[model samples]
Target: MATVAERCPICLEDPSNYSMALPCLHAFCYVCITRWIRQNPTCPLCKVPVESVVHTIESDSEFGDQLI
Candidate 1:
């Protein structure tokens, strides 16, 4: 089977290519943004803060890891 690609709505980069989004609906390449969250857990795109309060946002898509 072939794999599909998932990209961030804002950055338009492959989600798999970036760090995963928090429950807050923000996503960036892990290699690209994990550092900022290491300092402060906030979305680089929306400024939404991430914390223990935020968890992984769930989707109803049949595609598990691939958001689509």
Candidate 2:
């Protein structure tokens, strides 16, 4: 099973508060990323261009529930 971290790398707070995924597959808080992109539109982790960033959905349910 894959584990999801609850914190955002930018603000160092709960990413679930407001998160968005980058093209490089890294996730961060939307506010942080929005503010960051004003200066550098790149993934903080992989340095990928934000132009390629895509939104992804995540489930908070258990594995069994997910299968349903």
**By lDDT, who's the top model here?**
2
Model 2, range 1-68, lDDT digits (tens) per residue?
96776466567766763446444556665456756665866666656666533445455444665557
Q: Of the candidates shown, which would achieve the greatest TM-score relative to the real structure?
A: 2
Superposition-based RMSD of candidate 1 using all C-alpha atoms, in angstroms = 10.6
Which sections of candidate 1 miss by over 4 Å? Answer: 1-16, 52-68
Candidate 2 TM-score versus the reference? 0.53
Residues 8-50, model 1: lDDT tens digits: 5445556564445555545454444555666755566666665
- The TM-score values for the models, in the order shown, are 0.37, 0.53
Write down the lDDT of every candidate, Cα atoms only.
0.52, 0.59
In candidate 2, what residue range of length 10 has the lowest lDDT sum?
A: 52-61
Worst 10 residues of 1 by lDDT: 52-61
- Which residue pairs clash in candidate 2? none
